Amino acid sequence: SQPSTANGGFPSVVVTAVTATTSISPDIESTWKGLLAGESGIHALEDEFVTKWDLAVKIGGHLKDPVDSHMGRLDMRRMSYVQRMGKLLGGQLWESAGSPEVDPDRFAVVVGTGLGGAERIVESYDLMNAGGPRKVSPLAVQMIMPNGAAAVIGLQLGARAGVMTPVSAQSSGSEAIAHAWRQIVMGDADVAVCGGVEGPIEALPIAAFSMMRAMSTRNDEPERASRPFDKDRDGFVFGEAGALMLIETEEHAKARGAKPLARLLGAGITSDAFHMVAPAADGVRAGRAMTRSLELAGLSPADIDHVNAHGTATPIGDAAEANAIRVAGCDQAAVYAPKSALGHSIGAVGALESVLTVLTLRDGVIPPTLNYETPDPEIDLDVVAGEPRYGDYRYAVNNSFGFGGHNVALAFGRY
Amino acid sequence: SQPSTANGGFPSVVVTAVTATTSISPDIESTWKGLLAGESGIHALEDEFVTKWDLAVKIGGHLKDPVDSHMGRLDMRRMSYVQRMGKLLGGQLWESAGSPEVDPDRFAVVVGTGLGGAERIVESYDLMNAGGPRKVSPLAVQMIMPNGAAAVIGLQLGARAGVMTPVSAQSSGSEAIAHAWRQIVMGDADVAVCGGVEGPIEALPIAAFSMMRAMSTRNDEPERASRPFDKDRDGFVFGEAGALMLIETEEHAKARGAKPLARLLGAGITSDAFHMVAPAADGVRAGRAMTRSLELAGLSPADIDHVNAHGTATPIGDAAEANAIRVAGCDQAAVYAPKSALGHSIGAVGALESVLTVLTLRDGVIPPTLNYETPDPEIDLDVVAGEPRYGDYRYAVNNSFGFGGHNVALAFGRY
Ligand SMILES: CCCCCCCCCCCCCCCC(=O)O[C@H](COC(=O)CCCCCCCC[C@H](C)CCCCCCCC)COP(=O)(O)O
Ligand SMILES: CCCCCCCCCCCCCCCC(=O)O[C@H](COC(=O)CCCCCCCC[C@H](C)CCCCCCCC)COP(=O)(O)O
Ligand SMILES: C=C/C(C)=C/[C@@]1(C)SC(=O)C(CCCCN=[N+]=[N-])=C1O
Ligand SMILES: C=C/C(C)=C/[C@@]1(C)SC(=O)C(CCCCN=[N+]=[N-])=C1O
Ligand SMILES: [K+]
Ligand SMILES: [K+]
Numbered sequence: 001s002q003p004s005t006a007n008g009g010f011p012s013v014v015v016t017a018v019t020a021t022t023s024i025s026p027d028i029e030s031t032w033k034g035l036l037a038g039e040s041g042i043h044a045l046e047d048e049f050v051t052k053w054d055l056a057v058k059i060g061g062h063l064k065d066p067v068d069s070h071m072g073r074l075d076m077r078r079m080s081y082v083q084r085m086g087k088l089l090g091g092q093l094w095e096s097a098g099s100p101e102v103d104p105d106r107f108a109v110v111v112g113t114g115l116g117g118a119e120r121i122v123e124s125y126d127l128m129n130a131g132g133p134r135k136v137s138p139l140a141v142q143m144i145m146p147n148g149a150a151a152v153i154g155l156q157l158g159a160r161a162g163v164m165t166p167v168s169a170q171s172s173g174s175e176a177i178a179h180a181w182r183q184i185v186m187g188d189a190d191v192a193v194c195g196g197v198e199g200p201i202e203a204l205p206i207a208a209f210s211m212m213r214a215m216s217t218r219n220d221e222p223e224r225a226s227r228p229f230d231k232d233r234d235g236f237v238f239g240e241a242g243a244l245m246l247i248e249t250e251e252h253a254k255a256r257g258a259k260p261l262a263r264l265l266g267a268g269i270t271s272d273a274f275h276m277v278a279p280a281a282d283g284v285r286a287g288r289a290m291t292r293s294l295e296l297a298g299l300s301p302a303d304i305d306h307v308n309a310h311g312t313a314t315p316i317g318d319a320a321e322a323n324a325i326r327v328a329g330c331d332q333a334a335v336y337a338p339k340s341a342l343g344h345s346i347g348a349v350g351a352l353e354s355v356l357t358v359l360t361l362r363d364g365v366i367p368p369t370l371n372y373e374t375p376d377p378e379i380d381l382d383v384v385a386g387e388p389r390y391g392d393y394r395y396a397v398n399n400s401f402g403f404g405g406h407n408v409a410l411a412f413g414r415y
Numbered sequence: 416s417q418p419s420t421a422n423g424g425f426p427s428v429v430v431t432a433v434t435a436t437t438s439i440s441p442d443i444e445s446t447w448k449g450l451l452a453g454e455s456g457i458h459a460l461e462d463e464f465v466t467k468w469d470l471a472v473k474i475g476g477h478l479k480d481p482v483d484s485h486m487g488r489l490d491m492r493r494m495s496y497v498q499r500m501g502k503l504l505g506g507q508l509w510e511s512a513g514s515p516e517v518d519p520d521r522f523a524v525v526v527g528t529g530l531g532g533a534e535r536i537v538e539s540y541d542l543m544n545a546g547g548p549r550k551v552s553p554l555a556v557q558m559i560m561p562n563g564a565a566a567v568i569g570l571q572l573g574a575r576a577g578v579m580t581p582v583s584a585q586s587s588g589s590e591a592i593a594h595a596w597r598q599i600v601m602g603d604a605d606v607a608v609c610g611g612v613e614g615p616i617e618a619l620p621i622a623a624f625s626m627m628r629a630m631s632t633r634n635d636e637p638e639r640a641s642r643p644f645d646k647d648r649d650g651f652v653f654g655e656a657g658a659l660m661l662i663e664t665e666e667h668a669k670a671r672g673a674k675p676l677a678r679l680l681g682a683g684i685t686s687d688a689f690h691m692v693a694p695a696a697d698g699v700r701a702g703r704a705m706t707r708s709l710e711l712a713g714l715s716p717a718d719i720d721h722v723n724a725h726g727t728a729t730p731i732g733d734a735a736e737a738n739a740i741r742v743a744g745c746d747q748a749a750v751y752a753p754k755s756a757l758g759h760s761i762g763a764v765g766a767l768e769s770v771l772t773v774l775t776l777r778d779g780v781i782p783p784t785l786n787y788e789t790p791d792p793e794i795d796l797d798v799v800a801g802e803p804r805y806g807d808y809r810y811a812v813n814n815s816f817g818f819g820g821h822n823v824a825l826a827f828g829r830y
Contacts, residue, residue: 147819
């Protein structure tokens with residue numbers, strides 16, 4: 001029989017610190033308390049750009065505390081936005097972990113993002129068109145490259161056991177934590193900072209996603225717009241975020257006196273080979289990512305108390321995910337869809353939701369899924385709604401999926 | 416004692432097909448013959464953009480056979496360039512493999528790239544500036560996303576065991592092969608298509624890299640410009656490429672009667688935590704990636720016959736790599752630097768050089784490193800030059816490094 005976390009074939013990996021910035025709060029513990037209290041981060045957008053272009057979408061969640069309020073003159077000129085978010089969160093995470101001195105040669109970083117420093121592409125383009133090739137910054141390459149945010153964090157914190165950036169669109173932040181877990185269990189690292197970062201809401205990203213016709217335009221009631229698993233859902237809402245966690249072997253954590261928040265037990269990654277921007281309706285490969293995380297953890301489907309759904313509030317996305325949860329045998333788990341309150345942050349969002357899954361285990365509580373008002377018969381799931389649901393949750397799976405047909409499931413356990 | 420390939424703790428993984436397009440030829444077997452004969456793909460750039468912008472760099476290698484001569488007009492509008500390259504190479508590779516019918520649920524794709532569909536970002540930007548948000552293509556997101564090429568190949572070939580895109584700048588194409596090897600040995604796939612693709616030489620990328628002051632400007636003698644490990648080297652030269660290989664367990668290859676070209680034995684990934692765009696002068700972490708690939712292969716450095724150097728021909732880059740090769744105990748091996756003839760293709764280049772490494776082992780021959788005329792005493796390496804060198808090569812390491820401080824080494828063996 002093959003190695004699992006349960007049979008001791010893989011070393012035990014624990015989560016020992018988490019950090020996130022969201023549309024509710026810069027403080028992840030305050031985001032968590034706000035979720036439990038039924039708070040939404042989704043508001044009318046007041047940006048000039050909305051009026052300038054008369055955008056059909058006029059709602060979204062900007063960060064409560066803008067990243068650039070924390071950035072000095074040189075950081076504004078030498079990093080792209082996702083790099084600035086990565087530096088800010090990396091520093092916060094390391095402080096939260098008690099600023100440990102670790103062996104850099106056993107310390108990895110794995111941070112996903114959906115796109116990278118794209119604003120610096122269009123700035124460089126305009127600069128060159130206006131003034132020629134000598135107007136392009138010598139730092140343009142290193143700001144633009146999508147591994148840029150990960151590399152910033154690796155340099156900031158001193159990681160020498162690998163710095164990796166997987167990109168898989170809306171699953172990138174979960175996929176990064178999966179690859180960090182693989183790097184540890186394969187013996188290449190003992191500690192890893194991992195998660196996802198993403199840019200802010202801006203006109204051109206809203207335009208591009210709007211022409212796919214999958215965004216909510218419930219502009220008169222922003223907080224009611226994101227309705228994952230609800231019968232009247234009508235597309236997703238942007239909500240800014242970035243999120244990192246620190247994971248390490250249990251023996252490394254114990255040696256330094258760190259108190260684990262949860263266990264990261266297993267990771268499954270599959271793909272649909274179905275359609276570029278629609279999930280397979282049958283949920284089969286997505287369900288197999290969940291199953292694979294269980295096999296690696298040493299769990300059975302009946303052990304899973306909780307699923308943190310990718311739950312984007314698109315009609316076809318939530319339906320496919322409900323089928324995937326059935327395929328995995330996890331459809332008696334209690335389900336939360338955090339995008340109901342925090343919206344969608346693309347490359348960051350699977351990291352953010354993995355951090356929420358950790359807090360559910362730590363605190364034995366699931367926040368209500370907002371806007372869940374009319375159960376949908378196609379979606380036969382136990383969606384937590386109305387008020388928090390408390391329980392002694394032992395094991396949970398966090399789901400994330402991405403354009404391209406990427407499926408990533410992470411299996412966490414209570415510590 | 417940890418698993419290794421030699422001790423059977425990992426399954427045997429073989430390379431069973433390769434495909435590449437380069438500045439010398441669209442046909443990898445012709446490229447290889449051309450390399451052996453001392454041919455270079457690097458010429459004067461005749462593009463009008465060179466004179467338009469008066470670019471300081473007026474040399475490079477465009478593909479001998481442009482991707483778009485093979486593309487229908489629908490793909491020209493609805494795929495990014497790296498997606499079109501991935502479709503072209505993925506189809507060619509599958510035909511070369513005998514178009515096998517594999518279990519899709521055991522078939523993964525891992526393809527790296529330095530940036531993704533970035534020309535569609537500037538196009539969407541211009542369209543919106545000119546005509547408003549409803550002029551953005553409904554296909555823009557799926558063309559732009561940097562996972563787009565890997566996803567096109569996953570859908571084209573039917574890969575359901577995961578589609579991954581590692582981004583690590585100039586090491587992405589080797590990093591992809593490392594991750595595909597890890598995925599098979601961890602039991603998540605039995606067969607994988609892997610490698611790297613990258614865009615073409617164009618004015619803005621030239622401007623951006625040239626402003627970093629590390630490119631060769633030997634414009635009057637284009638084929639003499641790229642001189643890795645030469646005492647008179649004066650920086651790197653772009654040479655377009657894309658490359659993919661098919662790897663699978665030896666059992667899977669034997670069952671379908673595929674003849675292997677080589678063995679993929681081990682992979683090591685580390686990071687410098689030194690500087691964003693200069694390698695660590697000591698070569699210590701880069702050397703450790705080499706050592707890690709040997710630990711996983713079950714080899715010692717005294718086993719290594721051949722190193723395929725990253726060898727970009729920058730003064731500091733080649734010096735650091737020579738130190739790395741010493742740190743790893745690999746400095747008695749025969750060294751080849753293919754960028755001397757094919758130039759640098761960023762995200763594709765490590766995949767291309769992995770394919771060349773396979774060919775060396777298959778054919779018992781190393782091509783000459785072009786332009787290698789004056790040995791540099793700080794480089795005390797056995798650089799192959801003048802003539803191809805025939806030998807009974809059994810084990811080789813392919814090196815690739817990337818902005819960010821990424822180090823990737825792959826250990827290959829003769830079949
Ligand atoms: C939760 C939101 C998620 C959206 C994610 C989209 C990806 C974001 C990409 C990076 C955005 C960074 C923006 C930071 C700087 C900033 O904001 O600068 C504004 C001025 O606008 C700009 O420069 C806009 C620049 C546009 C850059 C190109 C965007 C291309 C978007 C694509 C066409 C569509 C999205 C593709 C996603 C692919 C991957 C995921 C499937 C304030 O200027 P000022 O006050 O400082 O003067
Ligand atoms: C081996 C070279 C490697 C360099 C690659 C660098 C990155 C590649 C990025 C993608 C490039 C794809 C270009 C394909 C389309 C094409 O060819 O269109 C031309 C017309 O020009 C354009 O639209 C070019 C517009 C440029 C797009 C933005 C590029 C941004 C470059 C960054 C500012 C600098 C490089 C960043 C690298 C980061 C990652 C690696 C560290 C023919 O047009 P036509 O004859 O069909 O009319
Ligand atoms: C293969 C396509 C997939 C998995 C599509 C999904 C379900 S994954 C996902 O995040 C969405 C929501 C729409 C796009 C959200 N993007 N943003 N932000 C989907 O429709
Ligand atoms: C951390 C920085 C590193 C590894 C830089 C290296 C050695 S990696 C690499 O390919 C180069 C050459 C310069 C850039 C070439 N890029 N392109 N094309 C370097 O200088
Ligand atoms: K989730
Ligand atoms: K190489």
